[PDB]
Symmetry: C3
Subunit: 285 residues, 3 copies
């Protein structure tokens, strides 16, 4: 359960960070699939390894620490989160929650997140961007909701509503930007269902998920979104369709993370460009 | 998680309470959405803080109590202060008060809760008698009974057949009918969302299509513990809000309207429970 | 009280067992419903009580690893299972399967008792698992949650052909050619963490999710076996017809489940023996 994502600990992390950068983030960006280049494209960047932030949860990519990247992107002050805390890795709720709440105290108003997901919706193609317009939080329905435990009233209410969790205006903007930049055809909106993971969904599971009205399935993101919505950060989330979910037990096609990475790699340039352009048009200063 | 809800710990809590009161409750009541609590005759109000190894509620200036007394001539114990799983309470913490009730002599547990109305035919303030449930956390390996079975209390694999005693439901309906508010009463399937987030429109749509009538974040664990130890159950959801099914609507479930609709129906709900208890069969 | 199912701990346990037996099993069998007499059929057999295997999970009459030969093949039979509804950890469930891997197991055959959701199912039917819905898994209680043990498998295992189709085809042919093809179905097994039987509403929902049988086990081991590359054959004995009607008097009862399983145990044993008999030998 790392350090409790309470106001005390979150403030402490926040203040440590504020020592290290003069950048007050307006936008938090959770680097998921296809956003690896975005991270690297931050201007006047300050890079703060998780290992350099006391009480910040620790995650590593093959022994390399995740980083907090501060700077501007499309003229906007941002904090890019490079290194996420997936529940399938065993991370506790407080661990996932803390970075988001730190973002809150840091000044973040809008969280943008990407992920890789399997396309349940049969109209989806590989490489499609599915803007999350809603989610089904299977772990949350089953008592693994990231918010289970004492509510941190400092951050939000005991029973947050998740109405407009995926800010409809941000979604309208994102679609708009895709349309204007000639890749609206790649952009869909859909329901993202979280499979706790880390197993890919079996065909029966995919078939069930599809029947439940899920468009894409992934193993991430929702808990972050919940914490974000809980503390009043607006959320924009896109799933990169990194594979078409197999609904048929007899198919020899099988999901594999290498192809997920491949699709993320191939769509990273467009996704970055898209996020940069969305950000450029975020209504403010 | 402070104490395993086994026969020894439970017996100890029961025996302690029995020093504190001579009332042997036949009916255990858990009020989620009165007021009833208030109107129990000759009440002995025992704070949880007074009961060692009994779960203790979070504060807020309102510690929970076991209220013992008579309602409609019947001996009852009212549980004021519930332990909801979304709070991070453990299985043992939720189980124990119910098993305590068993030892104290509770034969019937009556529970109210607030729920989102999934069923489109429902309106705010409606009462949905639970006739069945979908225990999503239970299915997903968070069943309150997960762990060593406490044989003192019940079987390893409890059937949840007639879990919402059909006779109690029939009586409850009859009573609501006889008292001019039968039109408010429905029966349906309660699905537990572990919570504490309200359900997204997509979740509600999924829940509705799973055959769920109302959704809430409580009750089932208690019901499971009760049925496991053979307490009959009557449970009703007050539809404190209509679940929003599509993401377009401004919508928004809110604990405020929960308390509101709650209050609006609190005296009816309490009246109903009293009148039901009035007509329960008596040994 | 739970040792990580990592390569170190699993090797220690495997190596220990290897100093109690020289049977290198190629087939692991996990005794569920209808299995139990299976051990009797095992020849040149050594019983190894779990109590005798350091760091091996311990279970109620302590469970046993039974090594030996069945239908001309080296098998290890796991007698005594670790069910998540008992409170056992993922590591407890995972370790024996991973031990089997190290011991040389190529094929895991498993039976369980299940409620028959599919309305065409009869009591005592065999439903070969051809797929599953791991409700605990979707809900963040997947046995693999935690650091991926790379010695065993990949971070994100696919569950494609989890229920090896060739094993399933063989199983069916054996049933068909031995006069009980009519007892044999294939279906989707959904795991209810349990230990409560499914309410009528739940069964109804599960049926509508596309589930044929419901039980409280098996999937975790299947997931661990698929993760480390063990092929899986799994059969649910329909030990009761799930009740979908909340107005029904019929109810699941474990005594009956045990009774129905015990009744089919002989046929289930014969089936497994005959399947093994026909397994490709290299
Ligand atoms: O089809 C899929 N099912 C579930 N999660 C997926 C799928 N495709 C991509 N992801 C996501 O990408 C990584 C695993 O490859 C995970 O982090 C998961 O969230
Ligand atoms: O629409 C709903 N979804 C889930 N729980 C609800 C809903 N309406 C009422 N409750 C109940 O109200 C409390 C929070 O207000 C929760 O404890 C829940 O059980
Ligand atoms: O109808 C059922 N639902 C769930 N599990 C079942 C059912 N029938 C048999 N089992 C299995 O047998 C034991 C309980 O009797 C459990 O271990 C469960 O996995």
């Amino acid at each position: 359960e790392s350090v409790t994502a309470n106001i005390e600990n979150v403030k402490k992390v926040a203040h440590h960070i504020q020592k290290l950068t003069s950048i007050v983030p307006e936008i938090g960006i959770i680097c998921g699939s296809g956003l690896g280049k975005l991270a690297d494209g931050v201007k006047d960047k300050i890079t703060i390894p998780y290992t350099k932030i006391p009480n910040f949860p620790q995650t590593s990519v093959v022994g390399h620490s995740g980083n907090l990247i501060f700077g501007t992107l499309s003229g906007r002050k941002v904090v890019v989160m490079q290194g996420r805390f997936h529940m399938y890795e065993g991370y506790s709720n407080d661990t996932v929650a803390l970075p988001i709440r730190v973002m809150k105290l840091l000044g973040v108003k809008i969280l943008m997140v990407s992920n890789a997901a399997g396309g349940l919706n049969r109209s989806l193609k590989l490489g499609d961007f599915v803007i999350l317009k809603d989610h089904i939080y299977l772990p949350g329905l089953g008592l693994n909701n990231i918010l289970v435990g004492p509510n941190q009233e400092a951050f939000g209410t005991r029973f947050p509503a998740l109405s407009n969790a995926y800010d409809r205006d941000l979604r309208k903007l994102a679609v708009q930007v895709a349309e204007e930049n000639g890749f609206g055809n790649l952009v869909h909106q859909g329901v993202y269902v979280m499979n706790g993971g880390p197993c890919y969904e079996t065909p029966a599971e995919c078939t069930m998920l599809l029947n439940m009205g899920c468009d894409v399935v992934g193993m991430s993101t929702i808990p972050e979104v919940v914490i974000a919505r809980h503390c009043g950060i607006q959320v924009f989330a896109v799933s990169l369709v990194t594979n078409i979910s197999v609904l048929d037990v007899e198919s020899d096609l099988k999901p594999n993370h290498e192809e997920v990475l491949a699709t993320g790699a191939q769509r990273a340039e467009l996704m970055q460009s898209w996020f940069e352009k969305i950000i450029e048009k975020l209504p403010k200063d």
